[PDB]
Ligand binder design. Sequence first.
Ligand code: NAG
Ligand code: NAG
Lengths: 50, 50
Amino acid sequence: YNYLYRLFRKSNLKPFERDISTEIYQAGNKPCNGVAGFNCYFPLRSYSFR
Amino acid sequence: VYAWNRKRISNCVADYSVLYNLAPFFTFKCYGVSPTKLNDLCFTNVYADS
Ligand SMILES: *[C@@H]1O[C@H](CO)[C@@H](O)[C@H](O)[C@H]1NC(C)=O
Ligand SMILES: *[C@@H]1O[C@H](CO)[C@@H](O)[C@H](O)[C@H]1NC(C)=O
């Protein structure tokens, strides 16, 4: 599970573009400040190779 | 879970905000697709079990 892939992207990236931001998703109208729930999730998702 | 009931979904306008309303709801993880894509996605012959 050390390897990870970004499940959530705010805006589709440009060609040869890189994103390192790790912030819980703000899809909820209320700010998901350090809160992961409905419409709130940090973009990282573990590859979890088995 | 011994005798699980099945039901089939059709001609459905599905809004999942009402599910986000209930505080007891704690599992929104989808084995199939991203929750954001779920709102935009469309399907047929949708099948649900409880
Ligand atoms: C939103 O969630 C509350 C809490 O269960 C519920 O009472 C209400 O009917 C839901 N819908 C609206 C439109 O408030
Ligand atoms: C259950 O019914 C209520 C109506 O009183 C409505 O808000 C919704 O359909 C359900 N409540 C939820 C999901 O909180």
